[PDB]
Amino acid sequence: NGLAMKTPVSILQELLSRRGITPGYELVQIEGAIHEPTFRFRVSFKDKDTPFTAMGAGRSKKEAKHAAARALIDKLIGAQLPE
Structure with a gap:
């Protein structure tokens, strides 16, 4: 549940950290x-x-990068990253 109620970008940064x-x-x-x-x-x-x-x-270069990085997270957790 730690992936819920948490900005996907923040989740990315946390996991990478x-x-x-x-x-x-x-x-x-x-x-x-x-x-x-x-x-x-x-x-x-x-x-x-x-x-x-x-x-x-995504709609921008930065957003697109975040979307791609989120796809990585999905693969890492083996599921759709919740919001």
Whole structure:
């Protein structure tokens, strides 16, 4: 329940702080509207002697990175990260 009532971004920062991980990001594709384009980013990091990767998207470059990083969290916990 510790993942509930907690900003997903804060959860990301907490988990990365606990492990001591700095993930990297890569621009995948920008598509959508002129005034409202959608940003696709990929994120990857190494831990537990295995590589991780995930791809997300959002309304901005920063938000897209957070979405991708949240996808990592989902894989780490093996479930949909609650709000």
